[PDB]
Amino acid sequence: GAPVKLTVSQGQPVKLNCSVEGMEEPDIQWVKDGAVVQNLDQLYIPVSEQHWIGFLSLKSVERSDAGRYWCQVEDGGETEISQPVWLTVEGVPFFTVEPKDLAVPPNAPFQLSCEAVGPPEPVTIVWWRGTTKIGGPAPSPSVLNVTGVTQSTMFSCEAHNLKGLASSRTATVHLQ
Ligand SMILES: [Zn+2]
Experimental method: X-ray
- The reported resolution of this PDB entry, expressed in Å, is 2.0
Distance CA 56, CA 43 (A): 7
For β-strands 14-21 and 80-81, DSSP reports them as antiparallel
Distance CA 129, CA 123 (A): 20
**139 CA → ligand 1 middle, Å:** 13
| Phi, psi (deg, nearest 5) at residue 75 | 70, -80
Total number of domains constituting the chain: 2
81 and 107 in one domain? no
Which SS3 state, helix, strand or coil, does residue 93 take?
A: coil
Distance CA 168, CA 88 (A): 22
**160 CA → ligand 1 middle, Å:** 6
**119 CA → ligand 1 middle, Å:** 14
User: What is the domain extent for residue 18?
Assistant: 1-91
103 and 82 in one domain? no
**59 CA → ligand 1 middle, Å:** 29
**Preceding omega of 84 cis (within 30 degrees of 0):** no
CATH number of residue 164's parent domain: 2.60.40.10
